[PDB]
């Protein structure tokens, strides 16, 4: 249904912010092996998170919900145009560049603010 695949995104989506403030916590601390993991399960997050957003988009359409389908359409949008500041994030990371992995870490907790606005206004609306 609409509202189970709604909340298992929004599950899916409080473990990747967790998991993200656990990351930004390890980094500031210089911890790069628990950076390194938190990275690679972030990212096992995002496609968990790609799929719900999927069947969540397909269930919105059919039953014909306008307002949360346009919400839906911009999280979506967010959400994959994101994926160019994560990679960015990663390549950081790779090369040893601390500066940039702190710039992109904070610039992405922004759109991840962004994101949990726009589903708590999917959540209202469906």
Same mark, same amino acid.
């Given at each position: 249904? #609409?509202?189970?695949?709604?909340?298992?995104?929004?599950?899916? @989506?409080?473990?990747?912010?967790?998991?993200?403030?656990?990351?930004?916590?390890?980094?500031?601390?210089? =911890?790069?092996?628990?950076?390194?993991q938190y990275l690679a399960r972030g990212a096992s997050?995002?496609?968990?998170?790609?799929? /719900?957003? $999927?069947? /969540?988009l397909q269930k919105l359409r059919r039953e014909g $919900?306008? !307002?949360?389908?346009?919400?839906?359409? !911009?999280?979506?949008?967010? @959400?994959?145009?994101?994926?160019?500041?994560?990679?960015?994030? %990663?390549?950081?990371?790779?090369?040893? =560049? =601390?500066?940039?992995?702190?710039?992109?870490?904070?610039? #992405?907790?922004?759109? #991840?603010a962004k994101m949990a606005t726009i589903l708590d206004? #999917?959540?209202?609306? %469906?």
């Amino acid at each position: 249904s #609409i509202k189970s695949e709604f909340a298992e995104g929004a599950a899916v @989506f409080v473990e990747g912010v967790a998991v993200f403030l656990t990351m930004m916590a390890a980094f500031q601390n210089g =911890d790069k092996e628990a950076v390194a993991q938190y990275l690679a399960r972030g990212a096992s997050l995002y496609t968990r998170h790609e799929e /719900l957003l $999927n069947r /969540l988009l397909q269930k919105l359409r059919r039953e014909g $919900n306008k !307002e949360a389908v346009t919400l839906m359409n !911009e999280f979506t949008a967010t @959400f994959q145009t994101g994926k160019s500041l994560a990679n960015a994030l %990663i390549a950081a990371f790779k090369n040893g =560049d =601390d500066d940039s992995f702190e710039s992109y870490l904070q610039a #992405i907790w922004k759109v #991840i603010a962004k994101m949990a606005t726009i589903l708590d206004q #999917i959540a209202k609306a %469906i």
